[PDB]
Design a protein around this ligand. Structure first.
Ligand code: MET
Ligand SMILES: [Cl-]
Length: 240
């Protein structure tokens, strides 16, 4: 009979990708059971608490910081895709239009906050210190001529505050659920050669299990690459 494999995922793109791989896995004796979560904490907690076998929602910087903060030992299995992060505005059409004292909201977790600040640096809105890392904070800003006010709120909440700020830097999974189009709507956007490949994550006990390996291989398949390309039209970039 089939091997059970339970995977927590954010709904878009992750759970969509998993729904498309699920039949391929069934044909290799693996019964993939997908559980959707809307947040960036519970998928890890569920795996670490031995409730689910794996998850698919985060990048490696986030994982490493999560294990540090929580004292857990979740491990990456394979990389799947990149979601270049965009800056969105309901009020302005290009960065040059941002007013003095503009409110710019970014995620309040260490890695996605740092990532957002790095995009602001790349786009020339602010400048970060020369020795900055990818966990930069607003304290690391060395130039802010427009006196931008950097606001920090939980990642999932940013689409809901978009109309109440001048600009928001929104994780693509959340942007796509909100019907934002990163390639058309973004005022600035990351490149895809970045630290932020989204990874399948599991535990030491199952990373090298037969079922886990079959899932990992399916997630590098030509078929999944095609799905990602046609479905997300460049908003989600295959990492293989
Ligand atoms: C929980 S780390 C952020 C994950 C999100 N899908 C991104 O790539 O931006
Ligand atoms: Cl753990």
């Amino acid at each position: 009979g089939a091997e059970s494999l339970t995977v927590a995922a954010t709904p878009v793109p992750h759970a969509e990708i998993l729904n498309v791989v699920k039949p391929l896995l069934a044909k290799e004796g693996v019964d993939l059971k997908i559980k959707e979560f809307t947040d960036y904490v519970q998928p890890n907690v569920q795996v670490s608490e031995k409730r689910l076998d794996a998850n698919f929602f985060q990048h490696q910087p986030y994982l490493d910081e999560f294990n540090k903060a929580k004292g857990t030992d979740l491990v990456a299995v394979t990389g799947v895709h990149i979601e270049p992060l965009g800056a969105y505005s309901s009020k302005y059409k290009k960065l040059d239009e941002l007013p003095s004292g503009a409110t710019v909201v970014i995620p309040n977790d260490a890695t996605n906050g740092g990532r957002a600040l790095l995009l602001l640096d790349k786009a020339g809105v602010i400048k970060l210190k020369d020795n900055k890392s990818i966990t930069a904070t607003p304290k690391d800003i060395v130039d802010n001529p427009k006196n931008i006010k950097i606001r920090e709120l939980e990642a999932a909440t940013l689409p809901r505050v978009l109309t109440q700020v001048d600009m928001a830097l929104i994780n693509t999974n959340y942007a796509l659920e909100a019907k934002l189009n990163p390639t058309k709507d973004a005022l600035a956007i990351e490149g895809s050669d970045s630290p932020y490949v989204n990874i399948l994550v599991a535990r030491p006990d199952n990373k090298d299990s037969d079922a886990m390996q079959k899932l990992a291989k399916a997630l590098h398949s030509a078929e999944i690459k095609q799905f990602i390309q046609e479905k997300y039209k460049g908003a989600v970039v295959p990492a293989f």
